């Protein structure tokens, strides 16, 4: 029933959704999500925040939503998923376009 978290999906922002770092996290109980920008703490605000959009049982699909980002937001983004059973960690390179998407 209970299990360690697993980041089954983490990719660079797509053409249709340029301001979102997409992810899929599995875990039981709900894993705590934490981001790192080039190894440094990413303090979440109204400009850069985590939002899980679809919650299907032990599956969590969401984005690191960025509001009007520039080249100053480009870099290495590490997502860490933890619960009391384990830890999973995956990283991506992000390059942000000046338009939301197509």
């Amino acid at each position, epitope marked *: 029933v209970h299990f360690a978290p697993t980041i089954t999906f983490l990719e660079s922002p797509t053409s249709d959704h340029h301001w979102c770092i997409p992810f899929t996290v599995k875990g039981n109980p709900k894993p*705590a999500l*934490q981001w*790192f*920008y*080039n*190894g*440094a*703490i990413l*303090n979440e605000s109204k400009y850069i925040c985590t939002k899980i959009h679809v919650t299907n049982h032990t599956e969590y699909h969401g984005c690191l939503q960025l509001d009007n980002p520039t080249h100053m937001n480009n*870099g*290495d983004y590490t997502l*860490i998923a933890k619960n009391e059973y*384990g*830890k*999973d*960690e995956k*990283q991506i390179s992000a390059h942000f376009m000046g338009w939301p998407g197509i």
Partner: antibody
Amino acid sequence: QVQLQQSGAELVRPGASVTLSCKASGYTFTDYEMHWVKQTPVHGLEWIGTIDPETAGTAYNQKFKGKAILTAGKSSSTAYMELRSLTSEDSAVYYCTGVTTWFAYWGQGTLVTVSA
Amino acid sequence: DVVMTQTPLSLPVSLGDQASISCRSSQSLVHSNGNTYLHWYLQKPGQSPNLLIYKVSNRFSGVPDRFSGSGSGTDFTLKISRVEAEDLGVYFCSQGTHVPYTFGGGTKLEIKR
């Protein structure tokens, strides 16, 4: 501004105990891991243990078990490390550091001199 | 306990040249989650250690292009292309894979003159 502010230098007599503090600011202290590191010229850098301030859950290096005790003030945003039954082997610079497997944030260090 | 052997202990290198620090683990640093938690730090005299590279090759925010890391499993390297005066200090390797987390002995960078 992520800042780890450590308490001042301590001069403690052998056999006594000292409590070292580390004020964390510029982030949500309770959401991240806190680590303590010891530096000596002979042994170099040694990892003491780690605390998760939300759950108060600890993990220690076997060689610091019973010597060091890690606690966290949740409302105060402060990490504490107690050093018991002090010896000359406990005279070192102690560092509070975070916030994951890599240590991007370090305090200025606390010098602990163990002498009569 | 994982032993981190750093070689050499002292590294003499002329200004503008390249320095090469080696860190050797006693056990594989690949975690079950798939990550290799090998980090590099620089401790300038009188100061607290500073992070240079996290997870074998990733440069920490603000670290110059000149610093680069490589390796896998047990053998690892730190390279500083075109060494500067501010690069002076002790270079440490660290592992965050196995508990207790361990640090290497340190490599003191020396400017040859």
